[PDB]
Write a protein that binds this ligand. Structure first.
Ligand SMILES: [Cl-]
Length: 357
């Protein structure tokens, strides 16, 4: 196929029917070598597609679906992501409020787009996106749908996205979405200092430290995406060792048990009675079928978190008192994976150390 260049220009035709036909024929070419065409004329096609998606009148279910599909494919390019975020600031606002709209059938692929955009630090703007009110509202030419007041108590976008992920798993808020890929969004945004601070500080709308609301999903073994993203979010949240003592000893957060459960097993582990007594309550009287997370990369991520918590003496004391060493030892014994093994002994190397001077 030759002259795609002519076809892509019809994306900014004044006639809706033309735009409709153009994007319908272009979505197929957004994957693979032919995707180069969308970067023609300083990424004009991408700007046009964004304009099409946000159109309150002509932005149909299909056009949004096809438009977002294209962007998802093209968002692999750093330069494309830059256009999506900075060229027209309102799109990111449009995107996050559409995800929160529980009547939006394209919510999940929008979560995927959002998670891809989180690779760019421009994503940090999300932390500042807020509404004047719930209920229908106009904002910089955007028609924001009314918030469901029963489930969304905040006017801040980040809080609402958190609500979707925490309460919307297994289609519990919408028949259209489970918001799994918000886990990757959380993972990538928590890499940045300002993103990390959201997750480890108490928020106003519910009076809860956000990272605590994600911990339960470390054991959701029918949602690999959720486990992966949450694991990385926990790890990123522990970047500053000066915050470790507070986070570990906050009983409302109860952080440690949800890092340890994925590496704990009922069948394999040999742990003394005295050591078992010191485990967190959640780790005792495990069910007989309790097994470790089978995916090594997830386990290693949990071990990286434990290793981070070994940075301070107070941290190491806390981990030792909770029988983290026996747990790590048995993991080392029973899971023959060199990456896991290496991390296990790095943790022991730290827990072997006494107090500095
Ligand atoms: Cl999954």
């Amino acid at each position: 196929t030759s002259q795609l260049n002519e076809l892509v220009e019809f994306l900014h035709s004044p006639q809706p029917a033309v735009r409709q036909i153009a994007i319908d024929n272009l979505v197929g070419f957004s994957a693979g070598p032919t995707s180069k065409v969308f970067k023609n004329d300083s990424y004009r096609p991408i700007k046009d597609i964004i304009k099409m998606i946000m159109d309150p009148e002509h932005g149909t279910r299909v056009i949004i679906q096809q438009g977002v599909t294209i962007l998802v494919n093209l968002s692999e390019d750093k330069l494309v992501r830059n256009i999506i975020l900075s060229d027209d600031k309102k799109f990111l606002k449009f995107l996050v409020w559409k995800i929160v709209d529980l009547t939006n059938p394209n919510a999940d692929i929008m979560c995927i787009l959002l998670s891809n955009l989180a690779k760019d630090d421009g994503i940090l703007a999300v932390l500042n996106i807020k509404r004047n009110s719930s209920g229908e509202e106009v904002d910089d030419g955007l028609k924001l749908a009314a918030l469901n007041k029963e489930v969304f108590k905040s006017l801040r976008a980040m809080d609402c996205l958190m609500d979707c992920f925490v309460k919307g798993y297994d289609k519990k808020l919408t028949k259209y979405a489970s918001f799994n890929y918000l886990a990757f969004f959380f993972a990538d945004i928590s890499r940045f200092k300002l993103g990390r601070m959201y997750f480890i500080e108490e928020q106003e709308y519910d009076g809860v430290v956000p990272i605590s609301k994600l911990l339960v999903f470390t054991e959701k073994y029918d949602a690999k995406v959720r486990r992966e993203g949450v694991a990385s979010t926990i790890k990123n949240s522990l970047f500053d060792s000066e915050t470790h003592e507070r986070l570990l000893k906050d009983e409302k957060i109860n952080l440690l048990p949800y890092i340890l459960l994925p590496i704990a097993s009922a069948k394999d582990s040999e742990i003394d009675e005295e050591d078992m007594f010191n485990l967190p309550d959640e780790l005792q009287l495990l069910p007989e079928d309790k097994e470790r997370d089978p995916i090594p990369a997830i386990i290693c991520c949990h071990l990286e978190s434990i290793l981070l918590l070994c940075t301070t003496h107070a941290g190491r004391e806390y981990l030792r008192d909770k029988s983290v060493y026996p747990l790590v030892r048995e993991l080392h014994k029973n899971v023959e994976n060199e990456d896991i093994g290496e991390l296990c002994y790095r943790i022991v190397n730290m827990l072997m150390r006494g107090e500095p001077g």
